[PDB]
Structure 1
Amino acid sequence: KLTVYLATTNPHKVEEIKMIAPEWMEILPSPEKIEVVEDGETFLENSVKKAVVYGKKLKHPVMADDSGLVIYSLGGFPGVMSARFMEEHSYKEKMRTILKMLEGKDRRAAFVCSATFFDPVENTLISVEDRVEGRIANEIRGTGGFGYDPFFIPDGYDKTFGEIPHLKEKISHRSKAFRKLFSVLEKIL
């Protein structure tokens, strides 16, 4: 019933989103890579900006994700800088560096995801945000998911997303933000 192109370069993101989409959602890969200036202050701003740039060019309904790691004792770092921080380096160096940052510090943290729907024919835009609360692990563990998942432990668990990647589908920020986006969309039709 509703068909959408995904506004995203990230293949792990393509992956997570199709696997939690209801049957009434068809989620297609964008026919083209489109440069987006990601100069927003928040996940919401960047998510909307990707949805709008992609929507205007493709002239078809689109969905966008903007996401990252928020560490409370580091002022929300890396936040929107999640990818850009030490971007020439491996996620493993990034995680080691942030471990050094956190010695002696409260390790509370969250992955946040802003999920955006834009229909450029109707000029309807919907954006919702959700999060998964956890903590940074004392050490990098496991090879599942992507990015910072090897050192993030969701609340109510003692393993990292790198160790129990299947759990992302159930409780991660992206799963909940998009299910909450699907839910709104479902209602308004």
Structure 2
Amino acid sequence: KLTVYLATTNPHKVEEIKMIAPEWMEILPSPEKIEVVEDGETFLENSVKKAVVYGKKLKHPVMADDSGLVIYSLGGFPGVMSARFMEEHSYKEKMRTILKMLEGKDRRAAFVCSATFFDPVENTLISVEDRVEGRIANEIRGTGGFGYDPFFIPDGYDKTFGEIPHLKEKISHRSKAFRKLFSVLEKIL
């Protein structure tokens, strides 16, 4: 009933969103990789920018995601630099480095997702945020998920998202933010 483009060519993000989409939404990947300067100070600003840039180009409803790992004891690092930090290195190398940063520090953290819908015909924009609170593990565990998953333990669990990646579908920042978005869209469309 509604076909919507995603404003990301990140395969892990497309998979994760497709698997929680409502029965009434056909989610397609953008058929063009569009350049976006992601220079927002916050996830919301980057999610909105991407949504707007893709929507103006495609002239069709789009959704975007800007997301990140926030470690409270490190001033919220890496945050909006989650991908850009050590971007030519593997996530395993990034996690080993961040584990060294946290020696002697409080390990509380969150993954945060800002999910944005833009219809460029009507000029309706809806952006909502959600998060999964947790803590950084003391070592990397598992190879499931992607990115920082193998050292993030969600609230309520003792295993990392690398160890129990199936739980992302229920409790991740992305699943929660996009379900929050879908709920709004069900009300207003």
Q: Shorter-normalised TM-score: what interval?
A: over 0.9
1:71 aligns with 2:71: yes
| Cα displacement (A) at 1:92 | 0.5
Alignment of 1:13-162 (within 5 A): 13-162=13-162
Aligned residue in 2 for 1:11: 11
What is the distance in 1 between the residues matched to 2:36 and 2:104? 38
What is the distance in 2 between the residues matched to 1:160 and 1:65? 22
What is the distance in 2 between the residues matched to 1:10 and 1:139? 26
How many residue pairs match? The answer is: 189
Q: Partner of 2:76: helix, strand, or coil?
A: coil
| Cα displacement (A) at 1:179 | 0.3
Q: Partner of 1:70: helix, strand, or coil?
A: strand
| Cα displacement (A) at 1:2 | 1.6
What is the distance in 1 between the residues matched to 2:137 and 2:171? 18
Q: Partner of 1:67: helix, strand, or coil?
A: strand
* Residue-by-residue CA offset, 1:68-123 (whole Å, 9 max, x unaligned): 10000000000000000011111001000000000000000000000000000000
What is the distance in 2 between the residues matched to 1:68 and 1:25? 25
* Residue-by-residue CA offset, 1:134-172 (whole Å, 9 max, x unaligned): 000000000000000000000000000000000000000
- TM-score, length-scaled by structure 2: 0.99
How much identity, in percent, do the aligned residues show?
A: 100
Q: Is the 8 A contact 2:133 2:155 kept in 1?
A: yes
| Cα displacement (A) at 1:3 | 1.4
Unpaired runs of at least 5, structure 1? none
What is the distance in 2 between the residues matched to 1:59 and 1:95? 39
| Cα displacement (A) at 1:184 | 0.1
| Cα displacement (A) at 1:9 | 1.6
What is the distance in 1 between the residues matched to 2:52 and 2:149? 28
| Cα displacement (A) at 1:27 | 0.4
* Residue-by-residue CA offset, 1:39-87 (whole Å, 9 max, x unaligned): 0000000000000000000000000000010000000000000000011
What is the distance in 2 between the residues matched to 1:77 and 1:153? 17
Q: Is the 8 A contact 2:9 2:29 kept in 1?
A: no
**Deviation beyond 3 Å, 4+ runs, structure 1:** none
What is the distance in 2 between the residues matched to 1:100 and 1:145? 22
RMSD, aligned CA: 0.5
What is the distance in 2 between the residues matched to 1:124 and 1:2? 15
